[PDB]
Design goal:
35% of the residues lie in helices and 15% in strands. With 345 residues, the chain is of the alpha+beta class. Bound molecules: the ligand COCCN1Cc2ccc(-c3nc(NC4CCOCC4)ncc3Cl)cc2C1=O. The site of the ligand COCCN1Cc2ccc(-c3nc(NC4CCOCC4)ncc3Cl)cc2C1=O has 20 residues, from strand 3, strand 4, strand 5 and strand 8.
């Protein structure tokens, strides 16, 4: 076992010469040389077994990604874990290594309008597949959009991904939320658990805006500041949209705010393609029921040079619907079972 930044990476001898990439609350990613396929790969060490929530998220991530196969989505190529539940302290997911991500690219590179268009196309093409499986990504952001030197784009990090559940989307005002703050749709702060597909379209909207200027459109500094930033650009919600917010705490907060008029997109993005801003507007709609869906976004005139629904595949086996109540110890068993197919035996 090699250390990487203090963590044992128990993946050798097949995977050697490890370099730290990044991490999260319960895992670390490294590049590693695969001594079999003779390529570098990405390896995520996941260490979730001391927390039910991280176990839930580990099982979803693995189960979702094992069902998916698509050019614009990062798959799982191998899973390393111990041969018995007793000896299993971590799980390692092996994935295609990509050169960079959109976060790093936007900090260093101006994107031509043709690159923005192609990137957005690829995002939406992968998202069409995800949504067609009845899955939500729920943490779409530039650092989760990987790229290689030929500008192929793949969506990664399904750690917050969930099967859609729109009948249980309602919650109260200021309900805590885990996904990355700057890409949260307004309704998260108002009345939404983020259990419908419209949550991901908002994030893609934010990504498109950020591609146009190299800067996050809504960099909220804290939870309610995120909504402040959204309403500064979109302006005050209409009576009709405000009437869809039935929770009094949320509604009366909105009614307490000074009036704001809509900032026209062509004012924030003077050099942008007019069709790009027309799609941007439709993705960054305040009311989630009125917000554009993934297949309509693909059909938008901005993407006319790429749109080809016959070459925009859907999932063969969508998710049909309960791991919420299960303890740490039973989810470990389910993770062990879910990963059994990759064992030598
Ligand atoms: C612990 O997990 C948290 C959630 N995260 C974080 C993360 C980071 C990185 C990759 C990844 N990164 C690369 N290439 C790098 C891109 C940036 O620039 C250097 C190379 N290639 C394949 C993958 Cl899977 C995946 C994830 C992921 O799932």
């Amino acid at each position: 076992p090699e250390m990487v930044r203090g963590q044992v990476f128990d993946v050798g001898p097949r995977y050697t010469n490890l370099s730290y990439i990044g991490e999260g609350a319960y895992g670390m990613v490294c590049s590693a040389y695969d001594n079999v396929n003779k390529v570098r790969v990405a390896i995520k060490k996941i260490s979730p077994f001391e927390h039910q929530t991280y176990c839930q998220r580990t099982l979803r991530e693995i189960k979702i990604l094992l069902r998916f196969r698509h050019e614009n989505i990062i798959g799982i190529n191998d899973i390393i874990r111990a041969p018995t539940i007793e000896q299993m302290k971590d799980v390692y997911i092996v994935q295609d290594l990509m050169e960079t991500d959109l976060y790093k690219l936007l900090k260093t590179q101006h994107l031509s309008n043709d690159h923005i268009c192609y990137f957005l196309y690829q995002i939406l093409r992968g998202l069409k597949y995800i949504h067609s499986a009845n899955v939500l990504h729920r943490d779409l952001k530039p650092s989760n959009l990987l790229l290689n030197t030929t500008c192929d784009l793949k969506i990664c990090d399904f750690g917050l991904a969930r099967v859609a559940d729109p009948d249980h989307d309602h919650t109260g005002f200021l309900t805590e939320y885990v996904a990355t703050r700057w890409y949260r749709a307004p309704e998260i702060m108002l009345n939404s658990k983020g259990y419908t597909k419209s949550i991901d379209i908002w994030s893609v909207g934010c990504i498109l805006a950020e591609m146009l200027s190299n800067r996050p459109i809504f960099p909220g500094k804290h939870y309610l500041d995120q909504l402040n930033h959204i309403l500064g650009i979109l302006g005050s919600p209409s009576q009709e949209d405000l009437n869809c917010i039935i929770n009094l705490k949320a509604r009366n907060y909105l009614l307490s705010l000074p009036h704001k008029n809509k900032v026209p997109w062509n004012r924030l993005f003077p050099n942008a393609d007019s069709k790009a801003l027309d799609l941007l507007d439709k993705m960054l709609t305040f009311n989630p029921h009125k917000r554009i869906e993934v297949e309509q976004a693909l059909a938008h005139p901005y993407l006319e040079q790429y749109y080809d629904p016959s070459d925009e595949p859907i999932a063969e086996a969508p998710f049909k619907f309960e791991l919420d109540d299960l303890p740490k110890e039973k989810l470990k068993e389910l993770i062990f079972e879910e990963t059994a197919r990759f064992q030598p035996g």
